[PDB]
Amino acid sequence: KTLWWEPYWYAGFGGMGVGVYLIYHAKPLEALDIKYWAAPRAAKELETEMRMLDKLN
Amino acid sequence: GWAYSGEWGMLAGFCFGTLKNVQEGKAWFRRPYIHGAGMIAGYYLFKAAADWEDEALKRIITRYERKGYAIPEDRKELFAANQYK
Amino acid sequence: VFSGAFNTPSSTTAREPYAKTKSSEAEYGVDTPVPASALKAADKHDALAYAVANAPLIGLAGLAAGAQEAYMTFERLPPTLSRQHFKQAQLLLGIIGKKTAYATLLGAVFSFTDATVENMRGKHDMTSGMVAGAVTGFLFGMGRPMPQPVAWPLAFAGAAVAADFIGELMPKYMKDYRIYGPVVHRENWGDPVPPRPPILDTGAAVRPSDPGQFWRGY
Amino acid sequence: AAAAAMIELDLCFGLLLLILFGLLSLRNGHVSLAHIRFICQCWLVMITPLEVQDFALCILTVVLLQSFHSFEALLFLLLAYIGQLYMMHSCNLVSFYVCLEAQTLCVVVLCGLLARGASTSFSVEAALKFLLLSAMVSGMALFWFSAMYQRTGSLDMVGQETFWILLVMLFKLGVAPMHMWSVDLYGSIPKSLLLYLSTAPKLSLFTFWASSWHHDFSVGVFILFSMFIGSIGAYGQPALRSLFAYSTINEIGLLLLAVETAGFHTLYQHLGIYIITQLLLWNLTDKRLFALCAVSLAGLPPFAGFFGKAWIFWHAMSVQAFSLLAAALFCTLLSLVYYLRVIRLFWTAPVHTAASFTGAPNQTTLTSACAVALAFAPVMLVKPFVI
Amino acid sequence: AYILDFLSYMWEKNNDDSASYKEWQDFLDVAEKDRRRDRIIAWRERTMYDDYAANAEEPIIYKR
Amino acid sequence: MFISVLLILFALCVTLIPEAHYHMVRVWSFVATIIPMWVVTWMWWNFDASGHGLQMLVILGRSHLAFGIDGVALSLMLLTTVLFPICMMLLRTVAGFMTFILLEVLVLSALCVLDLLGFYILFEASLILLFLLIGRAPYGSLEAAYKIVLYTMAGSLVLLPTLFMIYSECGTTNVLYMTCAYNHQTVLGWGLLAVLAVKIPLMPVHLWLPEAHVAAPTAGSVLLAGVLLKLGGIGFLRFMLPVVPEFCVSVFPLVSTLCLVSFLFSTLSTLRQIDLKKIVAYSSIAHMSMVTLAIFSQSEFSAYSSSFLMIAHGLISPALFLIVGILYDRAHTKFILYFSGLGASMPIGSTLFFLFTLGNLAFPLFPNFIAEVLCMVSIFAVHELLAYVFCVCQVLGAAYGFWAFNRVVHGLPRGPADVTRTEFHTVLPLLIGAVWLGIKPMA
Amino acid sequence: SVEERQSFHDKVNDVFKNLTGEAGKRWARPDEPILHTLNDEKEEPHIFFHNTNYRTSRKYINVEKTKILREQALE
Numbered sequence A: 001k002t003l004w005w006e007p008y009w010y011a012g013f014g015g016m017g018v019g020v021y022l023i024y025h026a027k028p029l030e031a032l033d034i035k036y037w038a039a040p041r042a043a044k045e046l047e048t049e050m051r052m053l054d055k056l057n
Numbered sequence B: 001g002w003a004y005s006g007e008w009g010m011l012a013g014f015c016f017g018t019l020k021n022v023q024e025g026k027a028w029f030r031r032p033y034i035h036g037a038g039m040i041a042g043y044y045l046f047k048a049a050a051d052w053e054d055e056a057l058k059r060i061i062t063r064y065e066r067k068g069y070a071i072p073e074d075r076k077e078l079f080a081a082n083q084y085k
Numbered sequence C: 001v002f003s004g005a006f007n008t009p010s011s012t013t014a015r016e017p018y019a020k021t022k023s024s025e026a027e028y029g030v031d032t033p034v035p036a037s038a039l040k041a042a043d044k045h046d047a048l049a050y051a052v053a054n055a056p057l058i059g060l061a062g063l064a065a066g067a068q069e070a071y072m073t074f075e076r077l078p079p080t081l082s083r084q085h086f087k088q089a090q091l092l093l094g095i096i097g098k099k100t101a102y103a104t105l106l107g108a109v110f111s112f113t114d115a116t117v118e119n120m121r122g123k124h125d126m127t128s129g130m131v132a133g134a135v136t137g138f139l140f141g142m143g144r145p146m147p148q149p150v151a152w153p154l155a156f157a158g159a160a161v162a163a164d165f166i167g168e169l170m171p172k173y174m175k176d177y178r179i180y181g182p183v184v185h186r187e188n189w190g191d192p193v194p195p196r197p198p199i200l201d202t203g204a205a206v207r208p209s210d211p212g213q214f215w216r217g218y
Numbered sequence D: 001a002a003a004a005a006m007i008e009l010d011l012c013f014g015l016l017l018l019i020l021f022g023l024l025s026l027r028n029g030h031v032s033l034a035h036i037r038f039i040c041q042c043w044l045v046m047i048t049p050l051e052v053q054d055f056a057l058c059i060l061t062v063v064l065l066q067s068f069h070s071f072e073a074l075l076f077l078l079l080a081y082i083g084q085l086y087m088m089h090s091c092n093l094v095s096f097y098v099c100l101e102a103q104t105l106c107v108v109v110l111c112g113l114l115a116r117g118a119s120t121s122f123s124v125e126a127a128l129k130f131l132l133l134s135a136m137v138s139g140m141a142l143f144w145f146s147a148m149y150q151r152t153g154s155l156d157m158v159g160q161e162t163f164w165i166l167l168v169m170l171f172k173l174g175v176a177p178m179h180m181w182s183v184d185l186y187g188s189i190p191k192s193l194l195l196y197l198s199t200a201p202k203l204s205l206f207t208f209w210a211s212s213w214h215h216d217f218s219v220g221v222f223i224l225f226s227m228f229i230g231s232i233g234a235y236g237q238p239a240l241r242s243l244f245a246y247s248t249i250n251e252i253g254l255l256l257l258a259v260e261t262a263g264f265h266t267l268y269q270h271l272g273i274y275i276i277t278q279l280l281l282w283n284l285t286d287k288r289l290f291a292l293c294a295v296s297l298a299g300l301p302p303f304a305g306f307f308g309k310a311w312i313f314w315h316a317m318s319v320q321a322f323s324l325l326a327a328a329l330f331c332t333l334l335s336l337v338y339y340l341r342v343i344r345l346f347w348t349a350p351v352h353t354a355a356s357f358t359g360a361p362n363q364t365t366l367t368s369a370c371a372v373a374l375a376f377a378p379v380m381l382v383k384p385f386v387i
Numbered sequence E: 001a002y003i004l005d006f007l008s009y010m011w012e013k014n015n016d017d018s019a020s021y022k023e024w025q026d027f028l029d030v031a032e033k034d035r036r037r038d039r040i041i042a043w044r045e046r047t048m049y050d051d052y053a054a055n056a057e058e059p060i061i062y063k064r
Numbered sequence F: 001m002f003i004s005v006l007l008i009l010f011a012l013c014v015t016l017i018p019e020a021h022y023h024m025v026r027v028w029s030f031v032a033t034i035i036p037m038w039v040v041t042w043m044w045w046n047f048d049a050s051g052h053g054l055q056m057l058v059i060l061g062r063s064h065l066a067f068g069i070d071g072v073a074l075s076l077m078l079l080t081t082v083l084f085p086i087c088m089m090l091l092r093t094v095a096g097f098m099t100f101i102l103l104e105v106l107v108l109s110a111l112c113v114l115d116l117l118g119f120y121i122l123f124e125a126s127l128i129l130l131f132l133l134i135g136r137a138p139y140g141s142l143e144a145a146y147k148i149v150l151y152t153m154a155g156s157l158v159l160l161p162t163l164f165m166i167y168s169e170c171g172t173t174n175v176l177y178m179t180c181a182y183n184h185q186t187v188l189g190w191g192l193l194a195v196l197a198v199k200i201p202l203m204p205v206h207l208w209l210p211e212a213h214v215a216a217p218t219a220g221s222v223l224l225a226g227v228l229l230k231l232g233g234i235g236f237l238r239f240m241l242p243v244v245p246e247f248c249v250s251v252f253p254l255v256s257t258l259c260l261v262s263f264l265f266s267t268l269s270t271l272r273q274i275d276l277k278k279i280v281a282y283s284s285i286a287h288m289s290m291v292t293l294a295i296f297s298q299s300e301f302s303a304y305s306s307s308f309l310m311i312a313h314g315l316i317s318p319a320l321f322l323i324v325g326i327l328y329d330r331a332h333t334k335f336i337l338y339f340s341g342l343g344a345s346m347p348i349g350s351t352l353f354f355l356f357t358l359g360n361l362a363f364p365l366f367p368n369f370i371a372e373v374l375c376m377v378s379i380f381a382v383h384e385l386l387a388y389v390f391c392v393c394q395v396l397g398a399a400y401g402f403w404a405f406n407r408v409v410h411g412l413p414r415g416p417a418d419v420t421r422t423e424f425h426t427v428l429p430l431l432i433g434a435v436w437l438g439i440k441p442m443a
Numbered sequence G: 001s002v003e004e005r006q007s008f009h010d011k012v013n014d015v016f017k018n019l020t021g022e023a024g025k026r027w028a029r030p031d032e033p034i035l036h037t038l039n040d041e042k043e044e045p046h047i048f049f050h051n052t053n054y055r056t057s058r059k060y061i062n063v064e065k066t067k068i069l070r071e072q073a074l075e
C-alpha cells in the first residue's frame, strides 16, 4: 500500500530535479553563466593583444 | 495614504470575528454577521488612518514652511500630496 | 551591486578630505550654562583638588545606601531596644557614617590615582582610568576569598572603560553627526538647509556636544 | 458675554439632570443601570472639545465605563474625568492643584467602595496608605507653589521651585523610588480600578506636560531608578499583580526617557500602544491571549509594542543620550525573561474557560478581540503617523 | 533535444532587458523619495505648546 | 509579491481544516511547503546571470520591506525550500506544522530583504517560535530555550540603536543608499558584529548552540543547523561588508583571532563529547568559523567560496542530524555507550552515516571538499599562515568523526533495525544534492 | 562648490532617468565606464552602479583570457 506522502514527494522532488536539469541544459548560455558572455569577448581582445605583444618583442 | 488599507482593514475584521468566536468556544465560521460588521468597521477605520497619513504630511510641511524652512518644489510634492502609494 | 567576484565599496574611496558641511543659516550654538562646580570638577592639573572636587559625589552614593540600611535596621528593632534613644542614634549613625566614609574613601582614591597617572604620563587616554579602577577595586577586594581580589579590580576598571567609551569617546567621534539638513559630505544630494538647528527642550542629561547638533532651550 | 461658555453650563446642567434621573431610577428598585451608563457616556462625549488628546481621553473613558455597575461609581468616574480633562487645559498651579486633588479623592473613594469578599480590608488598607502618601505630596506642591508665588509675584511657572513641582508630577506617575503606593494598590484593589489607574491619569498628566510645562532640570536618575527597579522587581516577584506593577514602573521609565530627550511623538505612540494593551490585559477571560500581551509588552518585533519601544530608542539615539539608552537596552533584555514566564504560565497549559450561568455570556469579548488586533496596526505605525 | 532549443527560445522571448532597467530605476526612485521625505521630517523641533516664541508663526486663537 | 501573498494564505489554511480529517491535514501541510520549492526553482530559471547584481526587485513604499535577488540569497532560498518539506515529514501535530510554516515565511522573507530595519523585523520575529519549539514541555529543555533566546536578544539589542543611528544619519535604511552615504562606521560596525557573531556561532558568544541544537527535535535541529546559522553569513555578505567596509578592514585582526580560536577550541571540545547529537552539534562551529574568515578575507572570489561552503554545510549536517534522530526515535537514547555494531543491524543507515561522515570531513566527491579548497584559496591570498592553521588541523576533525563512527557502527551488534521507507526518503534529497554539487556543480 | 556639485547631480539624475537601450545590448554590461573627476564616486549612485557593472565585466573577461591562454600553452 502506497504511503500518504509518496505521490506528493515524488511529484515535488522530481519536478524540482527536472527543473534544475532544464536550468542547466536548456537556458541560453549567457543567461546560465556570465563566463559564456565573456568567453567570446576575451578571445577577440586576446587576438588584438597577442600581436601587440609580438610587436613589443 | 496607502492604497491597500481597506483590504487590510477587511482582513483585520475577518480575524476579529474569528477570534471572537474562538474566545467563546465556537468554530471560526460561526455567526458570519459578526464577521461582516467587523469587516465594515475595519475597512472604515483603516481608511481613516490612511487619510490621517496625508493630513499629518500636510501639517508638517505647512508648519515647517511658516517657520522659515524653504523647501524646493521638487520636494514639496512628497508632502502636499494625497498620494495613493 | 552584489557579485561573487568582489565588493566594490571596499575599494571606492575619496581621494581628498572634505570641507565642513554647512547645516543651517545660523551656525552658533544655543545652550544653558554649566555650573561652575562642574567646570572646576573637570580640571585634572591639580590631583589633590581633583580628588577634593570629585569625592563628595561618590560619597553621596554611600550615604544613600547607608540611610537605606539604617532604616531597614531601625524597623526591625524590638521595643526594649528601640526606646533607648541614644543607643539607637549611635547604632544608626554608625551604619550611615561607615557607609559614607567608605564611599568617600573609594572615590578619593579613584580620583587621585586617575589624576596622578594622568599627570605622570603627560597625556589623556584610557590607561589612567584602568589603573585607577584596578587600584580602587583592589582596595575594595582586599581581605576576601579568592575570586574577589581579582574580580573587583576588573569590575572597577570595566566601569572606567565603559565610562570612557560611552561618555567621552563616542561623543567625540560623532561631533559632526547631523540628523537634519544636508547629508554630511553629500551636499550634492540636495537636502534643504533650515534657518537654524532644531530647538529641543531636552533635560540636563541630554545636552548638545557640538554647537550644530541642536539648539537646547525653550 | 457668556456665550463662549455653553459647554460649561451644559456640563453642570447634565450633572444636575443625571443625579435626579439616577435617584428616580433607584426608587423603582432597578438592579441594573445600563440606561444611566449610556447617559453618562453621552455626557462624556458632549463636554469634550475637538482636540486629538481630549477625544482620546473621552473615547478611553467611554470604553472604561462598561466595567462599572453602580450609580455612585459612575458619578465618581465622571467627576474624576472632569479633573482629568481640565488638567490638560491648566495653565497655572491653582487649577493644577484642584484637578489633581479631585482625581486623588475620587480614586480613594472608589478603592474603598468597590472591594468585596475577603479582599475588602486589604483594599481599604492600601487606599488609606495611598491617601496618606498623597496628602504630603499635595502639601509639598502647595508649599513650593507658595514659595514661587512669593518670589515672582505672578503665576508663571519659572525658577528653582519648579523642581519640586516636577517631583510632584513624578509621584503621580508612580516613578521609582516613589513607586510603592502603586505597588500597594496593585496587590489588593480589583481589576477594573487597576485598568482605570494604568491608562487615563497618565494620559492626562503627560498632556499637561506636553502643553504647558518647562523645567531647567533633569529626570535621568529617576529614569535609571524606574527602569532598573521595575525590571528587577518584576523578575523577582512571583505574584502576577506585583509582576504587572513592576513592569508598569519599567514602562513609565521608558516614557520618561522619551520625555527627557524631547520628541513627544514617540511618547504618544508608545503610550497609545500601552493603553490598548492595558485594555486587553484587564478584561481577559481566555488566557491564551495573555501570551499576546506578553509578546507585545516584551517589544518582540512584528507586534505593536516593538514599534512603540523602537521609536523611543531611535529618538534617544538621535540626540545621543547614550548612557540612559544603554540602561534601557539592558532592562529591555531583562524584561523578556518574565514575559516569557507569563507565556510559560498561560500558553503552554491546557485550556479551560468557564461558561456563564447567570447570563451576560463572556461580556467583554468584543473589546478584547478588537484590542488583540494590534497585530494589524503596525502597518500604519511604520509611516510618519504620530507626528 | 529540440525541447531544449525551444525552451531556450522561450527564455529569450520572455526576458525583457529594458523592463529590467525600468524596474531598477523605479526601485531607486521610490527609495530616494522615502529618504528625502524622512530627511526633511527629521528637522523636528519640540517645545511646549505655550512657547509663544518657538511657535511664533502658528495661527493660534486662545480662549482663556 | 502577489504569488507570495497567495502562498502565505494557502499555507495559513491548515488551521481551518477540522482535526478529524487526518489524511487531509498531512497532505495540505506537506503541499504548502512543496509549492515554494517549485516557485524558487522557477526564480532560478528566470535569473539572468549576465545581467544586474540585483534582479526581481520590489519595494513596498514607505514601510521599509524592500526585496531583491542576488546569487547568495538565491542559493540559500533554494536550500531552505528543500529543507522545509523534510521537516514536515518529521512532525505529527498541527502546532508543529504551523510553527514551521511561520518559520518558513520569516526565513524566506529575511533571506532576500534589502532593508536593515526590515531584516531586523523579519529575522528576530522568530524568537518566540524558537523558544516554544525548543522548550516544549515533556521532551524539550527550557534552559536551552532561555539560552538561545537571551543570546539572540542581547545581540539584536546591541544592533538596534546603531541601525537607528545610520537611519538618522542619512535618512534611510535601504542598503543601496546606506552604501553610498557617509556614515560613522565604527559604531554601526560594532552593532552588526554583535548580531552576526551570535547568529554565526563565534566564541565567546556561542554557548547557546550546544544546548539548543541538541534539545530541539529532529526537524528543529535540521532547521537550526542547515538554515538559521547562515543568516549571519548572509548578514555579513549583504549588509555589513557593503555599508561599513572601513570597519571591516580595521576589525580584521580581531575577527581573525576570534575565528582561529573558535575553530581550534571547538574542534578540541568535540573530541571529548559523549553524546552523538552533541558531537554533530559542535562540529558546525568550526565550519562557520572557516566561513567567517573566508568572508572577511575579501581576497579572490570570497563571496562565492563562502556561499558554497554555507550550502555544503547546509546539505551535510542536517543529514547527520537526521541519522541521529532516527537512532533516538527508535532507541530512545542519544548516548554513545548504548550503541555498538550498527553496521550489522542497520546496514543502510550505517552506509548513509559513513557517506555523510566523509562529507562532513571535506573528502572529495562531496561539495565540502570544493568548498574548503576555495575557502582556503581565499584565505591563503591574504597570508599563507592563516591558511596553514586550518590545513594542519585536519587530523583533529577526522579524529572525532572517525572515532564517533567507529564506536557506534562496529563491534557487537546491538541496537534498532534498519531504516524505513519514510526515513530513507527524508535522507534522500540531501544525498542527491551532495552527489551533484560535489561532482558537477557548475556549467 | 556646493552649487556645481548639485547641478552635476541633477544632470546625472536626468540622464539616467531618460535612458534606454535595445538590439542585443544588456544594460549592466556597459561598453565604457563613465569618466568623472569626483572625489568618492559613491557621491553619485548611478555612476557608482554603472562603473560597478563595468568593473564586474572586466574581472570576468580577464578570467576568460586566462583560460584561453592556458589551453594554448597546454597545446
Ligand SMILES: CCCCCCCCCCCCCCCCCC(=O)O[C@@H](COC(=O)CCCCCCCCCCCCCCC)COP(=O)(O)OCC[N+](C)(C)C
Pocket (backbone or CB within 6 Å): A013, A014, A016, A017, A032, A033, A034, C001, C002, C003, C004, F044, F047, F048, F049, F050, F051, F052, F053, F070, F071, F072, F074, F075, F076, F078, F079, F082, F303, F304, F307, F308, F311, F428, F429, F430, F432, F433, F434, F437, F441, F442, F443, G056
Ligand atoms: C555569489 C555567487 C553565488 C554562488 C553560490 C554558491 C552556489 C552553490 C552551488 C554552486 C552552483 C553554481 C551554479 C552556476 C550556474 C547556475 C546559475 C548562476 O550563474 O548562478 C546564479 C545563482 O546560482 C544559484 O542560485 C545556484 C543554486 C545552488 C543551490 C543548490 C542547493 C539546493 C539544492 C538542494 C538539493 C536538491 C535535490 C533535489 C533532488 C531530489 C548567479 O551567480 P553568479 O553567476 O555569480 O551571478 C552573476 C553575478 N552578476 C549577475 C552580478 C553578473
